[PDB]
């Protein structure tokens, strides 16, 4: 039937529609964006002379276009016949391949969604699917792109993922609130992902394997899925799928990409509530697989050992589960999963691990909450003072900044400022930074300022040579460029950049937030934890924080933690897991045997 | 003198008298105050010994200053007399291993 | 290439000639593919051009001539695969499947490879030939026949040299001056000419049909 | 400018060699080795 | 070799665990029900260790 069906479509080729139609006719992504624009139009969308009389042209579009797509993706053979190699089957999958170009069903993956918003007085305001794009169009789209193309490489998979699936799980683990899970779009965000989306990336999951060079990207798809498993208004069946894909994929990726995830977990798994079950299959599963990367001090080979941090973690949760256990009243099915967990993480933990003394000041605990899981709290620059020695640094990098300026302005092509011309948009003045008035040295300090004070505030040392910056010191417009590409971070220093990145993002985050509460809704995508964010969103952040770090770093300011160990505390009869679980275990047999007594 | 290396990276220029056996280093134009005075029919290699701290690390710049000749004109019997700068492919980077 | 304008601009035949390899049945010739006669109406044929020695085939790649969905028509040195053999079918109703085919009709062709119709688009100021979905009718005219009566017994589309004496001299143009505008100028000429490919002429006779017959 | 007699009748031969911006100078060692 | 040994005082705390579950044992396998297998594996693994 499906060949007959392709046939016949095939010699009748103006069932497609204009487009795909050839001569002339443009292709599917360029149709459905047409589409919108006709629904967005009133005078094309309705006639203008329950659904009632009217159409909505535009989605009557929309759906033809996802139909067809549809009922090709239905016709395109089965895989077994491919792997056959039967002849008739690899022609009609080379006949929809021709038909249907992946870019375009990419494309139409990636287009973006209208979301349901907020507006005054508290209210909900959703827009009407009748005249929209509807997850179900993209849901053809996969279909078709997964029966005829499929994706069997990781180049393919992860670009996809970053274009089309991501963007969509973040928009659906966005409508969250109870006004706002129980409208359509939220609705039908659901059934999309879990009847598309993520069975594709459950089926895709051995592809996972081997990125680790996208850890920016596989995080987001992590938290995304875990925030959207916490979720409320999702069907028993749709848990499911989110909990089989979540378990699929986390069995593939590498031990060392699952720390921010453990990191999350740690706050929920003790809850012990109806939730914490696929968390607490999560954690077995996990620490049962990448036992040695814990256990063993050489590690697992490839993937070496943990960093402590992990280890603190596993350590937190153990103890976490096991005392919450321990209050907790009998459950069976959290009791049948719950000792799995606490056995794997015992057995991961190497018995000798001697609990950390350096803990890190202002760990972001606070970034997140809970029933919020984001909490934009920057570190106070307000009560710490600058110090007078800086003050080289500041005019220095506040300078360079002002000529990168004046490099992307003149880039932009725009002439030198000798006279204030806004009307020919020569007004920025593009002066020399000395010439610039001294009321305009704000804004290209204050932002140092700020910078600074954060580092301070954080316990950092920035520390000067006398070797390195002695001779420094000493030492009609021409920029010139301190070209700090080649400049390359330590990995101390790339972790310190990371850490004022996600202040920056924590900053930005808190001002947009106070910005929408007093406009009373609508969130904005960039409003999710520097975790959860994708590399080309961090980018900008990551590029101001590095350009801070290696500025200091030429100029020889040595930026360092600064943070000694008082003493080793060895105490292999105090700080042991083992010792502090042999302990307890002693206590709670004695306790038996009280108890038992009475 | 600490800089920024904006203007140009840092060029240090070997320079070798093989009629009297001197070793010169100049730093950026002006002569360093390390010199040697190798024996008679020495074959000097050049060479870099380098860490890494960048993707891009340095190059052997096969030039020539004021009244100098390249080093191409003393490897090659047959470009003895041409002051034409040349990196003929026998010349090769070899490294310790 | 045109053949209507032949009184003005003669054609080139010599590239327009195929032979006709194998008429192998559609199951014949997917059970081959898994491993003298007749011409009858829906057997897969495989076309090899008579000059080059490939086979016509439907190449996989397409220069999308504004169409974006017909590939392009081209040869091909293998003749392994589906892409070489077309399905043959009347094009009216008067003739139907398994009819042996005349000569004067006219025959739909279609892909094994990929279904496609080898059709004749307008798209281009030129026209092309393209294995599209819309069907373009074909009519197969003969050239030349089984026969090739003897081993002399000049043909057309024969490529001879024009001797003038007993194997004395031939005809021929100037070539080793090295000139186009001398090498117009025709003469006999004697020597080592008789082996050159300067001394080669194509007979090409004044019809499309039968135009490899010989010649009275 | 240099003069083409003493130029051609020179022993003298010169390279150079660039470490690239971003490159610590302190890990790099210029020269010649036998 | 890459893991390190348990100290002395730990050892001791392992063999109280096991006298304490062995003291818990006696006499109290009807007691203690289907969970009498758990206690006595319990019991065996320690005496291994």
């Known amino acids: 039937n499906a060949n007959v069906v392709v046939r016949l479509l095939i010699r009748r080729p103006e069932c497609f529609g204009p487009a795909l139609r050839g001569e002339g006719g443009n292709g599917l992504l360029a149709a459905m964006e047409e589409a919108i624009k006709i629904a967005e139009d009133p005078s094309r969308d309705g006639p203008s002379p329950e659904e009632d009389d009217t159409i909505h042209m535009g989605n009557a579009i929309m759906t033809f276009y996802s139909a067809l797509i549809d009922l090709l993706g239905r016709c395109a053979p089965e895989m077994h016949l491919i792997h056959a190699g039967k002849g008739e089957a690899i022609r009609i999958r080379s006949i929809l391949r021709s038909l249907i170009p992946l870019g375009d069903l990419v494309g139409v993956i990636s287009i973006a969604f209208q979301m349901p918003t907020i507006a005054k007085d508290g209210n909900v305001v959703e827009p009407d699917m009748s005249a929209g794009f509807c997850p179900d169009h993209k849901a053809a789209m996969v279909l078709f792109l997964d029966s005829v193309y499929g994706i069997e490489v990781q180049d393919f998979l992860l670009h996809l993922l970053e274009v089309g699936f991501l963007p969509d799980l973040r928009a659906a683990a966005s409508l969250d609130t109870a006004a706002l899970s129980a409208t359509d779009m939220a609705l039908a965000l659901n059934r999309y992902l879990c009847t598309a989306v993520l069975p594709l990336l459950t089926r895709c999951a051995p592809l996972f394997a081997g990125t680790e060079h996208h850890a920016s990207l596989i995080d987001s798809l992590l938290h995304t899925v875990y925030r959207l498993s916490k979720g409320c208004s999702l069907t028993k069946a749709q848990r499911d799928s989110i909990e089989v894909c979540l378990l699929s994929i986390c069995g593939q990726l590498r031990p060392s990409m699952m720390q921010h995830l453990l990191r999350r977990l740690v706050f929920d798994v003790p809850l012990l509530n109806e939730h914490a079950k696929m968390p607490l299959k999560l954690l077995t599963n996990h620490y049962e697989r990448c036992w040695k990367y814990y256990c063993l001090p050489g590690g697992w080979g490839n993937f070496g050992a943990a960093s402590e941090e992990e280890l603190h973690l596993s350590r937190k949760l153990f103890w976490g589960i096991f005392d919450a256990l321990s209050q907790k009243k009998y459950e069976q099915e959290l009791f049948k999963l719950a000792l799995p967990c606490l056995s794997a993480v015992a057995g991961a933990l190497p018995p000798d691990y001697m609990e950390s003394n350096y803990v890190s000041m202002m760990e972001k605990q606070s970034s997140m909450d809970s029933e919020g899981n984001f909490n934009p709290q920057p570190v106070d620059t307000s009560n710490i003072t600058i110090p007078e020695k800086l003050e080289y640094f500041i005019n220095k990098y506040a300078e360079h900044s002002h000529d990168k300026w004046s490099m992307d302005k003149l880039a932009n092509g725009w002439i030198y400022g000798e006279i204030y011309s806004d009307s020919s948009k020569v007004q920025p003045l593009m002066k020399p930074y000395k010439l610039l008035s001294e009321k305009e040295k704000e804004i290209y300090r204050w932002p140092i300022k700020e910078s600074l004070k954060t580092m301070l505030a954080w316990g950092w040392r920035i520390e000067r040579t006398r070797e390195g910056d002695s001779m420094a010191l000493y030492n009609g417009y021409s920029p010139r460029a301190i070209d700090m590409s080649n400049v390359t971070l330590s990995r101390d220093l790339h972790a310190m950049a990371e850490m004022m990145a996600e202040n920056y993002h924590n900053i930005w985050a808190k001002k947009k937030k106070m910005e929408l509460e007093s406009k009373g809704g609508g969130n904005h995508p960039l409003l999710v934890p520097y975790d959860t964010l994708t590399a080309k969103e961090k980018a900008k952040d990551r590029e101001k924080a590095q350009d801070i770090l290696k500025f200091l770093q030429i100029n020889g300011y040595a930026v360092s933690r600064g943070f000694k160990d008082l003493e080793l505390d060895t105490p292999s009869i105090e700080k042991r897991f083992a010792y502090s679980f042999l302990q307890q275990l002693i206590r709670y047999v004695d306790e038996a045997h009280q108890y038992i007594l009475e | ?97 | 290439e045109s053949t209507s304008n032949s009184k003005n601009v003669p054609p080139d035949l010599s590239i327009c000639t195929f032979v006709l390899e194998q008429s192998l049945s559609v199951r014949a010739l997917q059970e081959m593919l898994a491993n003298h006669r007749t011409l009858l109406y829906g057997h897969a044929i495989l076309l090899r051009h008579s000059y080059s020695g490939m086979y016509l085939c439907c190449l996989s790649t397409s220069r999308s001539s504004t169409d974006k969905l017909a590939f392009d028509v081209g040869l091909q040195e293998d003749t392994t695969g589906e892409a070489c053999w077309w399905t043959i079918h009347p094009a009216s109703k008067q003739r139907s499947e398994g009819e042996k085919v005349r000569v004067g009709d006219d025959l739909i062709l279609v892909s094994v490879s990929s279904e496609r119709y080898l059709h004749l688009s307008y798209g281009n100021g030129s026209l092309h030939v393209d294995a599209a979905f819309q069907q373009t009718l074909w009519s197969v005219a003969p050239i030349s026949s089984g026969s090739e009566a003897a081993q002399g017994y000049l043909i057309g589309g024969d490529v001879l040299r024009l001797l003038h004496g007993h194997m004395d001299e031939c005809l021929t143009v100037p070539s080793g001056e090295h000139g186009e505008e001398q090498r117009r100028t025709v003469h006999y000429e004697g020597g080592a000419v008789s082996v050159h490919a300067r001394s080669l002429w194509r007979l090409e006779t004044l019809r499309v049909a039968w135009s490899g017959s010989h010649i009275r | 400018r240099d003069d083409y007699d003493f130029l051609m009748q020179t022993s003298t031969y010169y390279y150079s060699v660039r470490i690239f911006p971003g490159q610590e100078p302190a890990n790099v060692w210029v020269g010649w080795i036998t | 070799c890459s893991g390190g040994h348990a100290s002395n005082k730990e050892k001791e705390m392992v063999t109280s665990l096991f006298c304490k579950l062995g003291v818990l044992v006696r006499h109290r396998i009807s007691l203690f029900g289907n969970d009498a297998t758990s206690i006595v594996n319990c019991l065996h693994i320690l005496g291994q260790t």
């Open chain 2, 1 to 97: 003198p600490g800089q920024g290396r904006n203007n140009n990276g840092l060029e240090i220029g070997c320079v070798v008298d093989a009629a009297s056996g001197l070793l010169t280093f100049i730093a950026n134009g002006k002569e360093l105050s390390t010199y040697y005075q190798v024996e008679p029919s020495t074959k000097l290699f050049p060479a870099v010994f380098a860490q890494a701290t960048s993707p891009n690390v340095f190059q052997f710049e096969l030039g020539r200053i004021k009244n100098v000749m390249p080093l191409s004109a003393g490897l090659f019997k047959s470009e003895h007399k041409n002051p034409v700068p040349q990196c003929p492919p026998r010349l090769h980077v070899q490294f310790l291993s």
